[PDB]
Amino acid sequence: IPPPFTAPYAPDDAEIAARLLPASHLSPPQEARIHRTATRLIEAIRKRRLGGVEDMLREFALSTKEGLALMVLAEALLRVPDARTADQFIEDKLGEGDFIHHETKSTAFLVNASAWALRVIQPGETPDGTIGRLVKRLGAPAVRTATRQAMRLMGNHFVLGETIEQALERGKPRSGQKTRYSFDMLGEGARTAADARRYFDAYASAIETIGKAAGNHALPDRPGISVKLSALHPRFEAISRARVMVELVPQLLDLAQRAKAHDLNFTVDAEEADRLELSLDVIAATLADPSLKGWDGFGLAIQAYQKRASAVIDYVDALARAHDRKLMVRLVKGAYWDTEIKRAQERGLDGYPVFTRKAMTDLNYVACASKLLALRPRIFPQFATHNALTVATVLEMAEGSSGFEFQRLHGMGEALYEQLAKDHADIAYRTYAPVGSHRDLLAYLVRRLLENGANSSFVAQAADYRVPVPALLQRPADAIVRPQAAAHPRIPLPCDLFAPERRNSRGVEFGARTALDQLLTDVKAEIADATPDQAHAAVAAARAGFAGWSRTPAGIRAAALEQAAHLLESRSAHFIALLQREGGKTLDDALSELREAADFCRYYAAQGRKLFGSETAMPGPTGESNALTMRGRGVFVAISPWNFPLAIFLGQVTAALMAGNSVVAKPAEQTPRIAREAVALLHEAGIPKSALYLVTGDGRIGAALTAHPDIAGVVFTGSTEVARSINRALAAKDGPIVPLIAETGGINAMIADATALPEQVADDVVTSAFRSAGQRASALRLLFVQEDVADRMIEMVAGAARELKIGDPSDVATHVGPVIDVEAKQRLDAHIARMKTEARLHFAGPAPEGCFVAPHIFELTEAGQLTEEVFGPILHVVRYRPENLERVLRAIERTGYGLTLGVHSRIDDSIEAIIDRVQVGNIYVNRNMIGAVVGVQPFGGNGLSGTGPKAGGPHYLARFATEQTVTINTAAA
């Protein structure tokens, strides 16, 4: 038995290309046969009458969003009982008006079949929505034609139903016949326990349907089924490995046994790169069961676009050797390329787990295919591709043998593989059809549309007559030529995302067991109050250090911040441990705050050089110079919260310091130890002792600091009430009117309409409301959801919220740590008890013994029932009618807050109408509302949410400074 798979996550592309490039060399007569095969295949592709997705996209010059909208509308129209009824609709209503209504209803239909029944259309309606913009661009008649073509595609290439039973009934062959295709089951990412059971039953149900229609031939000439591990477990993630191995393995085994009893091909699909190791763990434990001996149909997909692909092949082979099994192994290039790039950047990884040049994937795919062909007969390879060149090359390397197959998706590669079958009679290819229910269509269509709409896609190019046939025949090695060119030149490494402005902080990929274990190990390996006199002395000492710090050159202040960033990341294990023990933060939140703290230092340093590093020359008359500068104001008092006790503490403090002010810093009572370490670190990084003082204690000590007549400003993050009293104590003084910078939370809403993917809304609602136990100023408090999808969305949020593990934040599996202290928990439980008597309850999770509040979900009759920011894991939901979006926006305006706002919608015109109407500081569209990144999402809002300027943005530092104009009459010279 091989040890648990653990290859390097993102090794260097050049070293890989240095081996693959010389080894790709094929002999001249080999390459000529490849050229001819692929030419004949492409000529058949260009024969041209069954259309495809890519054909529809190209014909009407549709974006992927527009393709999606029409295919969803098409699916809804196909399920209207009377075809003549759908035709009347297409002619008389579609494109005439009600554009957003048609897009909303047809999408709601996928989760709520009763949502749509076929109002009346007034003429002259402004064409908005995805459909309306399509009508303005192409004209209503072309939209009707494109919709009719989408209906043919949806009916011919998908096997769908309102439930899996209906899909399987529709995809059933005539009694006594074998199915002419294998089942690529729709379904991914269970969000709820019921989801995981439902997909399990769909798979078991599908295995019986194809089992009964399987023929009398032996493998490989029998139908197959494809399943996703993420569909079978609601927290399929590396940090939940322990429950995954206990719960998922028996499930996958049960389905594998049912597959074996019909002698089927049973294939585990390959998903995102951070699930690779977990999937192999689950697959290894499942294959190990002796009940699966004597059956040759078990297998998995392997993604060639991963640098680890070749090692996965070795691992799978040693598995088959160790258990004396035969496996069927599918080689694909990979369906998640864009996701892997984005994820690596967001996560600050030291590289990409995938190649970044298409030819490198194509090169690695052929190398992996050659490796798999040599592992026959123990490995039966399945080459799933619609690339005529890839097919031609793989066929040549097999040298005319058997013991393998090609694979395609229904609606793609048909002309390719028919021609291959004509020219080489012994070639087998497996055709999969997508099979599933409407509630799984949207998520699937999104991914399918990305590959078909891609410019680099082979099937898209081989069908565009503008692309000459010889262009599609360039061999991958000839496009790369040299190893140093393996990486794509226009995609920086995550560490270079902000170059040359500044460096980026490093993150950790939790789906790489070596990385997660090293971090867990490092972290495991790791104050009297101030009298009013000592706080008074602190101001006086900061006041005395101001002059020298103010006149220290900006580049030296900036160097100190950059060295502070260096020390934070070098000592990340220490601060993470402090964030877990003192802050109560889970490991993902602690790492993220540590990164944010370093990001604040480097960002304010770079801004600091631009702003205070040199003077701005003003135009003016000759004989006279005019120069504008900015300089420190004096002593800033910085008051910081307990919920970001390191990053907001350091953002506020280093901003004031960078602008040339000395600082007296008063941390939250609950988290002084992290603040002491941070202050000590800034001193060590070069902040003079006289420029920065820490004063710990109560709100009376915070009041004494902000009431002190010698301070030049206050930077404060906390509650509205305390900011007002600070503001009043400042206004009460007879001295100068000094700046107050305040961020004071929000009652943050999210608006989700029926065009949004309900499983993405659910993910983002669960994250935004319950991550960090809701102890974030940015957290989602109030979800507005359109009534046609409200039931499904609320139930999915509740089921997902139920799978959150609440407990000790040091345990790797914890999703929800404790709230900060007993007093906070008491405030939250009081609001929970009040909401139970006042509003509908949807979920009240079980809290472990101790200082914990569990996720809660309440539904309100009106938004007005929620009158306070409640700083915990407590979501409130209002369902609304689409014609009442104005009442939603008025409710959001009525709270007086304006920090974050989430918008989930496919419809650009709706998104824009919301953005135009609200004043909220941070609007997040089709993603969660939390974790603003320094210099990426400048963070902060208005109204009762605070004053600005936004932290982590280009207007922040100036507010800590005052301007100076120097005008010199130079005429004497």
Place this chain on the structure above:
Amino acid sequence: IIDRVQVGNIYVNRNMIGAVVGVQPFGGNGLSGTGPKAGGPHYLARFATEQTVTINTAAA
């Protein structure tokens, strides 16, 4: 003198009056006021509030 004082408008070897818009941004600190300087590049922003719009474009 310039290094020592915090005064908003320093006029060297000329009179101290008649600031020109966009040439001598006018305004100071302490009991002379809050800023930002009138007729300079930091004035208009203070009358405004910032907005960040973050769109997950990956669906496209």
